[PDB]
Design a protein around this ligand. Structure first.
Ligand SMILES: Nc1ncnc2c1ncn2[C@@H]1O[C@H](COP(=O)(O)OP(=O)(O)O)[C@@H](O)[C@H]1O
Ligand SMILES: Nc1ncnc2c1ncn2[C@@H]1O[C@H](COP(=O)(O)OP(=O)(O)O)[C@@H](O)[C@H]1O
Ligand SMILES: Nc1ncnc2c1ncn2[C@@H]1O[C@H](COP(=O)(O)OP(=O)(O)O)[C@@H](O)[C@H]1O
Ligand SMILES: Nc1ncnc2c1ncn2[C@@H]1O[C@H](COP(=O)(O)OP(=O)(O)O)[C@@H](O)[C@H]1O
Ligand SMILES: Nc1ncnc2c1ncn2[C@@H]1O[C@H](COP(=O)(O)OP(=O)(O)O)[C@@H](O)[C@H]1O
Lengths: 7, 371, 371, 371, 371, 371, 7, 7, 7, 7
């Protein structure tokens, strides 16, 4: 959900 | 009443019955949809294709993966895949049997919680359970100590275990994967004049990687040998009918596991992560861990990978002690093998989660029971 | 001729002149070096950056600390930092003035001995001296008895002093730190879907900790309050432009100072160490130590930390006596404050180490003179 | 001794001297040959025509391009064009002056290697050098950070640069071109009764495109406006003397840059490629890249293209930050402008490749020196 | 019917049958419990470990001593140890045989009284008896006069005996121990960079002490010899595989028996206590006590300890008389040796305590009978 | 010109002017010196402390008595105490006034001879005189016959006097003291778990003795009363803040004055010494001595001591005669009271020792004049 | 040189 | 039980 | 220099 | 000075 782009 | 063992990794999906030595369903997890226009009327059409059938007709469809890093990104594509396994590929009723599912160590909480509702509410199935894909590698070896290493295609990680006591302050997780090795290869081949840019073109780049790639024991003299002599230069044909000649990119692609700077990711490497995992442990149980290095990833199948890890750690360990890397030949299905043992086990029968337990608390029961 | 007072802790570096109430140079101690490739020609480049300038450009560099636990690990990075203070940040000649340096209580011998050669041989500076960072807290209070407690970022420790007589068989040192609290926080945030893994990503995790964290007076009901009501759940934005929502991890991170089992370090805690330090002392001077608990660490700035230590020790002390924790509001620079008093002091002028004393004996003179 | 700056794109060929603000030779790169039979004797004939002369007599010849995608396809046609520039169009000796050539980012290796032999062996010329056509756009702006976007006629691509450090894992290249926009237009005009099928007929379809085409800010209401009202319907005459009436195909042709499905190429588009290029970068230097979008392609000259990119990215960026697209009015020759600065630069004079360097190693020296 | 002889000192526990020359069970007295989490199911687990088994697995457990100074601190841990000796290590029925236990001279009353109930009520055992661990050293020598000195690990003390008549106003007890010598050693080693802080780390500091330590005959010149010449500097390896180099701390650790100011305990020393014990006696039987100094402690095994006591007392005695320190080579088990003689002795058979005697008076019978 | 009266017993030191009813300076005679290390600089320090100031800071110092049995052991500590009285505590010039000193009956000769030089040579003081501390008790009563008994803290003794004629062949001296009663008490308290072993710990054992101790009139039934009923069991707190419970040791400590075998000293007792002193006298003046038993020791203050001496001697005297023990309530300062009378007496003025008498003979004049 | 048609 | 710390 | 890892 | 120990 932040800097990952799958989170 | 026999239990069901279902493994769902990134890529291949494996399933079977309990009390067996080999699975029955192995097929990739892809969802495809067409993109051109239909003209002829009399044929029977479908809006999508799921199993191996979508692999046969890749010249039209647009392929799509649901899982990216071990995290469920699209839930509606996931319900089509589980519906495909319970009815079409394998034939069973859902409400007759209990199930058993596997996950990753440090994924977030909502990943292992939304999948509780689906296995209870929309599938009336009793007695599910969730495990971790590092404990299940030791049951295939039958040991009780050691340190594991599984990579496969989503993530690489390692968990140290001593005498049935796990050490939670020593788990290391690295996001370098298997599909990142595919994507770096199709960048290097543009230096000779080859170009593969489509989701359909990607799978004939994967098939090159599995056939002719190796991990060299040295790196500097290999760049000087292949630059002078044309000895290791081989060839390969593709479904167009043409001939592709590949040399000097055979060993250069798996070298990013030891130097991740080629992508640009700044990290340590696959060998310093294992060394720092032992160093964060105690001082008295280090000796039983240098002699037990099991290794059971799907990516581990490159030739020459076992002798490379022998040479690297002895430059870091002190000069007295002894190292030993264990590599069984059937180290691809070993996560499914350990799942077959724990389901047919007698003591295990008080660790299930009944349907009445879900009606008392709800979907937050899974953080209490299983771990 | 005015003396120089230089404090070099793990992290921030503080310096100034003697006879003053506030320092002039406050900046972190980081050495960075680039890692990408240079392309454009006309710019003027440097191989490294030292002061606050390396903090401004963190999107390229790889940051690095020289000091880990209060021990000088890399000497070549240390000479760049002392050269940066004497010339660039503060402007002075080295050979004009005497200096004054501070250390930790139980560091090994070669740490306070290699730094004698650098302050004499490569810097032609007369009259240095080495102190201990617990005596210098009492001069800021002006008292003459009591027991101190300084943590900061390297190490936490405490020294009991009565009437100007120190008790060497009662000093306790614990290696739980400040940077270990940063590293445990970025492990807990992966339970909602946040991931910060880079040396550059570390500093925006530190900045969350300083703004919204508190030490709760109770622990068990706080886990039941925040699980039912959504009251203490706040938000924060980051330099990407997005929004982060944090609840239930605000108080859970400073609870490791009272239960160090969450890391895995097996020890007692910050309150039983203070209780066992008084108990190893005599029987007649315990009464003057329950009424004098000064407390001057950099880590001490959490809200609600003074009322927590009131409640804990009264469960261990007998029911008659009286406890009192003293907390001045400017308790961050207090180690520099006491250094300003002892330099301008009149009796002190026979305690310097002249340059001729080094030529007679050598670098082993420091174990005899200062203590 | 003044250096020579030669740009050879797909289509137009530009050249001039160093230290100037405008080139001197601008002409297309076409090689034509006749196809009918000669009858009259007294005239003087030639087998081929090269420069603007082949453009004047297109009613007989068969035109031919040497470069297709940025790749030299036919070498014998290329030697006629370089011979035409050094002697006929511009008058110079080759052995007097050094040269400077430009290329594309991800073309294969043998393209920039066969052109080393021609500039040394058959043309006795010292001190050549090869650059990249994205760095040279920043010198025309004078900045030192930002992200570029050049399309022209061969290929479209973009390179992010921060503080003189390029990021090699973020370069994106797309093969949608300028001549593909010409070829799609002459397919749509057959819906009214116009048919242009010859290599000579192609150039009067290009000349329609440059005069009356625009990029609409919206797409759905424009299909409903022009279907009801006959307002934007204009006219044009051709060298036969007739009248052509064109409406509804004016804006419909440049819409394939935002939806490439109209050709059948499956890709993302010109705006999602720029968004995914920033997202693959770090987290700390994204803010300086939303405020610096230079844009210097030859294809960029459509009216209404700057306001369209303002509207699109704000639907993808978070709601706080600020975007800014920079468009200088003389953005057509800007690749030649930056070539004039770097040649007359003082520090640059150690970056040439002397003739003795070629005699030591050979044609593989170019992969080491320049990058 | 043979009696049982059980010695339970601080640390090692010794036991055997009557009428023998050597014991059969020697093992430390430690109770350990785990602290990590269990994962693997199929193993068989225990909550605690008692004998030598807890020594083998010290990398998990938390070790714990029941006896601190010769005083039973935790009774529930003591019942596990006596249950381990009567059944597992040695195999016997409890109700078949009489027992015999040993104590310290000036411990409080409730220590030798709670252990009466356990040997009668929960263990149905007849005929127990309690002795004193200084009388039992003379039976191993066979003499009838002299002065003893036993230290071991709990406490050091000395009792003067003449002709079978003990002198109760001359007994001296000092609380300097054996485990205090271990704890001072691990403080000194932090001056070179070694740090051992865990209950598990403590036992590899004990093992250094037993191998290379000696008591020097002089102290001042030894500090000047080892500071100039590198002659007595030796080395040692640890179970990690590394090398530790120790010099100048070999003799410096047992010097606290002669100067107890290094800990901070203010007392006299091991030689002035023996001199003041003779001086408090009469004037006519001093001559038979200077010639009989038996010495049978477990701590006495340092090399060079017998010649040091020769040199010290002659500086205090008058110049005419003669001193003599007796040191048998098997002076470690000598407290068990004297217990074997007194049990098989014929006159002794009226000194037991029958079970009917406990039913008449109660647990206060032990202060009357035995002394 | 008024004379000075100085009493210096073992323990307390008393002084004042002549012609008064109460002294002015009462303080113990202790010399203390520090033992830890000084750290803080700005304080003002002293090497030793003498008066009541050394009593206030006992947590650091090592206390020391100069006088042991009535014999000056260390002369250098004695000169500090006399210097403290003449200047600091009491303010006077030495050369202005005559002095008056007291001693013990059978101390050796050099004790009363070295103190002649100090009162003449280093203190220029005229007219000293030495008395005996048994004659001075009768002046406080005003009688002229009787037998005295003074113990205090050094020694106990008794002198019979009839009609102003002393009987030198009847003086009895016993070395049982007051500090020996303190030392036996801190041996008995280790039977419940209390341990006080330091010179600083000794004074809080003295303070227990003065508050709750009594002399029982019978001994055998008191051992049976307190063993059955818990009636006389009291409590006391100490400066740590804890609670001490003492029963059965209240009366058991002063019973050694009647049976000295508990220490081990073989003698008669305090009542048979008084009976044998009368029996060695004549036959005609025994009747006036049974009716006059004055008793003026500092140790005499125990409750119940007067009724005990009534009961004991009537078992030894014949059945006709009458006994009577006299005990004034202010019997503590009575040795100072008689010193005030004899100094202000008119006939006494020819008994001084002038300074010229010392210059004629020397220090051996004191055995001739005073007796 | 494979699937393009200028390579 | 007072000043030791095992009593 | 032994079990730490900065010593 | 003999058997005491203060004499
Ligand atoms: N012979 C091989 N050599 C190298 N890589 C292989 C080989 N066979 C399979 N792989 C890799 O294994 C990956 C998936 O393996 P596996 O671990 O079975 O699936 P999962 O990762 O889902 O558990 C594929 O991405 C493929 O790249
Ligand atoms: N407001 C705050 N709350 C909690 N911690 C803080 C705060 N401000 C600073 N710190 C901590 O103080 C540490 C360093 O403080 P300081 O003691 O001044 O430096 P040093 O430890 O080098 O002497 C930093 O690591 C930071 O974590
Ligand atoms: N006014 C215009 N509007 C749209 N396209 C144009 C215009 N002028 C030129 N072009 C396009 O620019 C292309 C070549 O431009 P340029 O970038 O100068 O050459 P190159 O691509 O070789 O560098 C031509 O194919 C033409 O289609
Ligand atoms: N070779 C040796 N040198 C020095 N100390 C020793 C040696 N062997 C044993 N010890 C000490 O003896 C102590 C216990 O000895 P022992 O007297 O047998 O036990 P206990 O004191 O219980 O009777 C241990 O703490 C150990 O420190
Ligand atoms: N209330 C009391 N009960 C018992 N003993 C006492 C009491 N008060 C004082 N003493 C004892 O008197 C001793 C000294 O008394 P004193 O005779 O005045 O001094 P000195 O013996 O020097 O003349 C002290 O050692 C103390 O033990």
């Amino acid at each position: 959900x932040a800097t990952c782009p799958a989170w | 009443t026999t239990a069901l063992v279902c493994d769902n990794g990134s890529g291949l999906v494996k399933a079977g019955f309990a009390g067996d030595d080999a699975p029955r369903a192995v097929f990739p997890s892809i969802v495809g949809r067409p993109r051109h226009q239909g003209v002829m009327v009399g044929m029977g059409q479908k809006d999508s294709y799921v199993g191996d059938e979508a692999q046969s007709k890749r010249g039209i469809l647009t392929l799509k993966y649901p899982i990216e890093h071990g995290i469920i990104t699209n839930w509606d594509d996931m319900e089509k895949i589980w519906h495909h396994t319970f009815y079409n590929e394998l034939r069973v009723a859902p409400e007759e049997h209990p199930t058993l599912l596997t996950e990753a160590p440090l994924n977030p909480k909502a990943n292992r919680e939304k999948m509780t509702q689906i296995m209870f509410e929309t599938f009336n199935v009793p007695a599910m359970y969730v495990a971790i894909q590092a404990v299940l590698s030791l049951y295939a070896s039958g040991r009780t100590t050691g340190i594991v290493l599984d990579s496969g295609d989503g993530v690489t990680h390692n968990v140290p275990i001593y005498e049935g006591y796990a050490l939670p302050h020593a788990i290391m997780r690295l996001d370098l994967a298997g599909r990142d090795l595919t994507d770096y290869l199709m960048k290097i081949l543009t230096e000779r004049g080859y170009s593969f840019v489509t989701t359909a073109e990607r799978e004939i780049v994967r098939d090159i990687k599995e056939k002719l790639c190796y991990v060299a024991l040295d790196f500097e003299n290999e760049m000087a040998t292949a630059a002078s002599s044309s000895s290791l230069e081989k060839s390969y044909e593709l479904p167009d009918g043409q001939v592709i000649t590949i040399g000097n990119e055979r060993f250069r692609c798996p070298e990013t596991l030891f130097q991740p700077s080629f992508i640009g990711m700044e990290s340590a490497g696959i060998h310093e992560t294992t060394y720092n995992s032992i160093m964060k442990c105690d001082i008295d149980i280090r000796k039983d861990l240098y002699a037990n290095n099991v290794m059971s990833g799907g990516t581990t199948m490159y030739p020459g990978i076992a002798d490379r890890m022998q040479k690297e750690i002895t430059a870091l360990a002190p000069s007295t002690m002894k190292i030993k890397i264990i590599a069984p030949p059937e180290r691809k299905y070993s996560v499914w093998i350990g799942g077959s043992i724990l389901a047919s086990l007698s003591t295990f029968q008080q660790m299930w989660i009944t349907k009445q337990e879900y009606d008392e608390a709800g979907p937050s029961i899974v953080h209490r029971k299983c771990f």
